[PDB]
């Protein structure tokens, strides 16, 4: 199922959701 800190580590590592807490874990 959905690992929240899995989702955050999605945001950081596709790299299409990088920058600010705004873009961070769940974009």
């Amino acid at each position: 199922g959905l690992x929240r800190k899995x989702l955050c580590a999605x945001a950081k590592k596709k790299g299409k959701c990088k920058g600010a807490x705004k873009l961070x874990c769940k974009c």
Side-chain angles (χ1 to χ4, degrees):
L2 294 75
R4 290 185 59 157
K5 60 177 74 284
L7 178 63
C8 307
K12 296 193 179 187
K13 239 18 289 179
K14 298 180 180 302
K16 62 171 62 183
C17 305
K18 62 185 177 303
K22 306 301 181 178
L23 279 304
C25 181
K26 185 171 62 183
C27 44

